[PDB]
Amino acid sequence: RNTASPVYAGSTAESLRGTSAGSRNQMYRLQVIQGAAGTRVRRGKAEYLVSYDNLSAKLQQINRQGDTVTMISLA
C-alpha cells in the first residue's frame, strides 16, 4: 500500500513503566488497524500500551471489535 511503519528496533521499543505497568512491570505495545463497525474511532491505525495483567483483556477487546493486530512487542 506504499506506506511506512514505525521503527521499534534496539531500545526504541521501550516505554516508561512507572506505577502503571502492573505486577510484572512490563508494557506491551499493540499496533492495530481499526474501523468503526461504541465510541468514535479517530484513526484507522492505533497503538495501545497495556500491562501483562490486562494483555488478555485487551486482545479480546480488539477481537470483539473486529480490528486487526499488526504487531505486538514488549515495551
Binding site: 516508561l16 461504541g38 470483539r64
Partner: protein
C-alpha cells in the same frame, strides 16, 4: 432526557457538559483537562491536595505513555483511591463507589455485588478494579480515550432501577461521595438484596426535603 427536573435533580450541570476526550496528538491543555476531569470523577469530587496528586501518573498521561483508560486505572488502583474508598468501607459500599466512579452509574442487581465481592475476595482489589475498566460496558461508553462520566440519560441496556439508584449515590454538584448524609454506610445493600427502589430525593438547596432518610 432530563429537562424540566434537571436543575432540581442536580443533573443540569452534566446536561451542559460534554465527554472529555483525549484526541490523538493532544495538546498541553487537553492533558490538563483530562487530569482535572479524571480527578473529579474517579475521586468523587473530593478536594485533592497537592501532596495527594499522582504526579507520576499525570506525567505519563501527559507524555502519551498511558492512555486515558490506563490513567483512570492508575488512579483507581492508587493508595489515594484506596484510602478514600476502600480501607474504611463495607465492600458493598466499595462496589457502589466503583460503579459510580468508573462506570458513571449505580449497580443494577445483587448479581453485580456477588461478582465483585467474590472477585475482590479471591483475587484482590486490583483485580476487581480491572473488571470495571476492562468491562464491555466501559468499552462501549468510554473506550480508550474518554474520561468516565455520569450516565443519567437512558441508554441501550439500561434498567429503570439504575436511574432511581443514581440519586442514592449522587447527592448534588456541590458534594462529594465522602460528604453525604449516609456517610460510610452502603446506600444500596437493602435495595439490591430485596430488588427494591426508593422515591428519588433530590439534592439540598433545590429540595427542602433533601435530608429524608428512612430508619433501620
Amino acid at each position: 432526557a432530563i429537562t424540566t427536573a434537571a436543575s432540581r435533580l442536580g443533573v443540569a450541570p452534566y446536561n451542559e457538559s460534554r465527554p472529555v476526550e483525549l484526541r490523538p496528538d493532544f495538546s498541553l491543555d487537553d492533558a490538563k483537562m483530562v487530569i482535572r476531569a479524571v480527578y473529579r470523577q474517579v475521586l468523587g469530587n473530593d478536594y485533592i491536595m497537592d501532596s495527594e496528586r499522582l504526579k507520576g501518573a499525570e506525567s505519563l498521561l501527559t507524555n502519551g505513555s498511558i492512555s486515558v483508560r490506563e490513567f483512570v486505572r492508575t488512579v483507581a488502583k492508587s493508595e489515594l483511591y484506596k484510602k478514600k474508598f476502600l480501607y474504611n468501607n463495607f465492600q458493598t459500599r466499595v462496589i457502589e463507589l466503583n460503579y459510580k466512579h468508573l462506570l458513571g452509574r449505580a449497580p443494577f442487581s445483587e448479581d453485580e455485588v456477588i461478582f465483585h465481592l467474590d472477585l475482590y475476595e479471591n483475587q484482590g482489589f486490583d483485580a476487581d478494579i480491572d473488571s470495571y475498566i476492562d468491562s464491555v460496558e466501559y468499552q462501549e461508553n468510554f473506550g480508550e480515550n474518554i474520561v468516565p462520566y455520569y450516565r443519567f440519560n437512558n441508554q441501550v441496556g439500561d434498567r429503570t432501577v439504575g436511574f432511581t439508584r443514581m440519586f442514592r449515590l449522587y447527592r448534588g454538584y456541590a458534594n462529594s461521595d465522602r460528604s453525604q448524609l449516609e456517610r460510610s454506610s452502603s446506600r444500596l445493600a437493602t435495595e439490591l438484596g430485596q430488588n427494591t427502589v426508593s422515591a428519588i430525593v433530590g439534592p439540598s438547596g433545590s429540595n427542602a426535603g433533601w435530608a429524608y432518610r428512612p430508619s433501620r
